[PDB]
């Protein structure tokens, strides 16, 4: 009559907000950056960066939805249904985490 | 509301000491070869990825290089979620 007591779930959870919080200002960073290439730099090197934060916003867009997939699932009940969200969870905050590691 | 390197290093730790009980769980019941055995010990490598980076994570942060201990959260979070979906993949 037990399975998953642990704090996993919650430090998925908690991870993947600090993220989402975080990747605003990193943001806001590289669109200025961006903006100054797309005026003065080279075209090739600003899109470059253009189809990368377009490939982060997707992975962002990926992470939020699973957050509230994540949410859900656990306000009704069913901590199971929520796994596969939570594996999707880490796999979203992977991707953002690696590619401003790249940027910076 | 904590450091997002130090909140990588609690889920490693924590996934760490599950995925670790599990394999040793599976091991003590169950335990080219059969594939069983190949299942197993790929878990079990797994694991060892998962820890040498959470050490090698715990290195960096105390060397002091900013570069070297982002990059090796980075790579955390990578182990983390390999491990986790391989995990998702067996239940």
């Known amino acids: ?3 998953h007591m642990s704090p996993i779930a919650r430090q998925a959870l908690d991870i993947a907000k600090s993220v989402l919080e975080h990747s605003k200002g990193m943001f806001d960073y590289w669109e200025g950056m961006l903006e100054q290439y ?10 470059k960066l ?8 997707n992975s962002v867009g990926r992470l939020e939805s699973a957050l509230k997939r994540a949410e859900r699932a656990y306000d009704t009940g069913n901590p199971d249904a929520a796994v596969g969200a939570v594996v999707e969870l ?3 905050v992977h991707e953002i985490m690696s ?6």
């Open 38 to 47: 797309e005026k003065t730099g080279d075209p090739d090197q600003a899109n």
């Open 90 to 92: 880490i796999g979203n």
């Open 50 to 57: 253009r189809q990368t934060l377009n490939r982060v916003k």
């Open 1 to 3: 009559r037990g399975s």
């Open 99 to 104: 590619t401003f590691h790249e940027l910076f």
